[PDB]
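Components:
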Amino acid sequence: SVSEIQLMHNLGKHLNSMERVEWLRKKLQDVHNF
Amino acid sequence: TKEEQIFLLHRAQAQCEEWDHILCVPCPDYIFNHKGHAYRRTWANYSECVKFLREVFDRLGMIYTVGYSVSLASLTVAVLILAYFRRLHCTRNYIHMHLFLSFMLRAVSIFVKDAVLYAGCRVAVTFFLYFLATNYYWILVEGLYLHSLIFMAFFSEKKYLWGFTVFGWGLPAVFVAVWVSVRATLANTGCWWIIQVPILASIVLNFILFINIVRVLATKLRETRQQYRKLLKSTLVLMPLFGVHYIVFMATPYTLWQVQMHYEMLFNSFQGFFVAIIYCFCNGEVQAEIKKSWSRWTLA
Amino acid sequence: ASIAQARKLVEQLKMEANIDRIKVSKAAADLMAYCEAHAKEDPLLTPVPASENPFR
Amino acid sequence: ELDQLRQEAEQLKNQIRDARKACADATLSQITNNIDPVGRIQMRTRRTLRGHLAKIYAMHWGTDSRLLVSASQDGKLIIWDSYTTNKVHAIPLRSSWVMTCAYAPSGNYVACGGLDNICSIYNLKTREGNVRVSRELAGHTGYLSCCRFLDDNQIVTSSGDTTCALWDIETGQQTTTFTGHTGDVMSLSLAPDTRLFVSGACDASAKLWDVREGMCRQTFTGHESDINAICFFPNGNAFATGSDDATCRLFDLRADQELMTYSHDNIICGITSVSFSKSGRLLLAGYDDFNCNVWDALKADRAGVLAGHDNRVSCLGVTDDGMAVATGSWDSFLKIWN
Amino acid sequence: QRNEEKAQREANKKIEKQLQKDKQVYRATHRLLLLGADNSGKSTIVKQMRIGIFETKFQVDKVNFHMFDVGGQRDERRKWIQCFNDVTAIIFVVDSSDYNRLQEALNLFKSIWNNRWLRTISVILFLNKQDLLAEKVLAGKSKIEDYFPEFARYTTPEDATPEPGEDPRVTRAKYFIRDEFLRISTASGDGRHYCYPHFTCAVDTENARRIFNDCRDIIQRMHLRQYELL
Amino acid sequence: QVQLQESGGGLVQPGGSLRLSCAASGFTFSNYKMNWVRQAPGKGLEWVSDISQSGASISYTGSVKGRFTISRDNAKNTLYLQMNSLKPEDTAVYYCARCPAPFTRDCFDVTSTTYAYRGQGTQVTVSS
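Structure:
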């Protein structure tokens, strides 16, 4: 349950799901339009 | 990457080639909440898939960076003070310098993660994991020293120093090298319990010695009002040393995740800032040493 | 016990009563002579070079 | 009759004290006013010795000015070499407790004692594997505070029974006793000629004893508290005395007066040891305040300060060549200074 | 020649070898100064440890002690007491029954406590001859208020645990004498040294470990005094 | 030369009074702690009272507590004692004593047989 190590691992996992925020917003707007 | 996520949807599109722009139904693995289903302008319900739809990670960056900055600075002007004439006691200064050293390696290895993610990807993370294990054992060793100075029949000091000095460097190195096997087994393209189970064991063992070291002060303060005041002032200066921050969150494997990040990063970072002051700056032992060593140096 | 030592106590004070004393000014001048006699050859009053010194 | 002796004693003392004025026609300060002072002195450590577990109480230089021995309360009597910082012998004792130690001018024998009341003499040049006790000087009722060698055979000892004694090691019996002191005698210094010695006791007074006769030639006094240390001016016509009243006092034997008191208003702790330099200008006195003040013996001004030791400086010594000074202390470190 | 300088360096190896093993035994042993009056019963307690200085050694739970009875010197003890400052703990034995010499014992304890050189060393007090005080109070000829007027209007402290078949009259007296000892111990209050009073008699087949347990407390407390844990 | 020469004291009826003095000379009075010590017929030396350099921590043996009163005048360099009630047990010679060390809070050996810094003593006696 070690805080530093666990947090590092979780950030590693999420690293992908960071820069796609903008793209994500655009796709969400597109789905709303649909 | 965004590029990879687009590629994974494009691969799913080429497989489909009806296509609705996301799927050709369990919420698709190639995107989403994956224990959810999407349901069937043509009507569709993806509410379950979007269950999860981050800012705190960037916010946390400055929280521990400043803390480990002041922590590293404070201990560097604290380890140097232990190199002054005498004040090189077995009891304190031959474990405090080693404890202080284990903060330097762990604190500097924090900044490596921010930089590298210098050394190779696998080595940078392996140095982090090992240097963190020693810091959580050197705090245990500190706890395993005062508790050995008391519950043992006196103590034959320096008969068992080598035994516990290796414990703060050796056993974690023994154990972390087992995780290197996992690194070989693991893909390592993405570059990411065995590492943690010992550390959780270290937290409980150090805490059980903290209730056996303040309980003894209960006996030795009443029998010597001011007694009640004196116990807590004495316990607060022993509060950081035995690493009793860690006991609350050691059980919880959840990562709730907000406070586990906010709380523990604040203290694990600033720990050096309020361990150097209470054991190398504020104490009269070195304050009386520094005031007269200063006069002796300026005497000539 | 008083009479044992008091008889010899007066016999103790006689010896220092019969000592030859001159002006204490001479004693001050006597200590002047000896202090300057070996001052030039005492390596504590003045530093001694490390060539001939045995503690370098 | 007891009152008769007390009254009769007073006029004998009165006429002695009245004569001392006649001698005191001036003070040393006026005659030494003209001379320039020594000024700033910068004594540095050279050769911090190690090896002793408990507090160093006593030490002594040899005649060669090279080997020195010191006793500590752990029960080791180890002889160093100053230049090479090396332990030539480490002599176990029977009594952890030892208040004194002296190195023979020949260097064949070495003295020590404390609570056993025995100035035990040891052979350094034993052919055997280990050194052996030559002869135990038993007979003192009280603790031995200082013993010093006259010759290979004759040794003078002060005990805690207010009595000095000369011993003969071959015979093994006390030849001459020195009775007169009221309080426990703490220290000795032999004269250069080794015909006289002075000895201070816990009565704020020093007594000049004749070695052959065994009677007090002259009684010195004027100290306010228990005297601790005593050393001849190298001439042997004068001596200084450290006491618990935190002053040193120079006394002339010939003049029978107290010329100068070495006191600074700030210092409020007793003097444990005293020694002179070879010139007899730098009176360096060891204090209870964990430092050693180098006094100017002529001008009565602190030329310098030797702030070395952590705990109280117990014993002092100056080399016979007059190169260096050594300072045993309660921190178990003999530091050699120069 | 410089060849001989190597010879002394080889001799130092044997010297250092002996000193380092001698350090091990020195640090292992506990020095204790046994102090007390002529009639205190210093010699009686030395008979209890069946396991002109008189040194005694006793093994308790395989830790070596050395307890120094000094009974050779003169009454003047201002310059030979200085030598016992490195000592672990002064075993100060006192006769409770001798009321006239009890004040003189109290004054001796005050001088030991407030001494510069013995300021750092704790004094394990043995209130000896507790049994002999027991029969003395029943006689009721000698009265403490004659020598100590404050005893008249003194009640027992709450922290009192009398032995079975003890009169309350004697219990107040018993804990008054220790209180008078402990009055001095608190006056300076700098936490540097600590009196450990105990109530003992001749028939007590103990005190081998009572000193062990008290000396254990000072060795534990001296560690904690370093960390600032108190 | 250190010397303590007493004055007053002598014969008086039980319940009387006596102002003892301890004119000290050959040392600075002001820095030393003083004490009173009495020697009863066929008994060891005994402690009477005390003074803590300024008159602050004064104490008594308990047997004489609430009867005698010590003072010192540092200007005149003198020590004082007051007598108000006198019992038969109180007939004894009274030596004025000085503490050995100058700036201390301990006094050793002041009731010793051959203590150096004790006066000649005054025989204070109570009888018909």
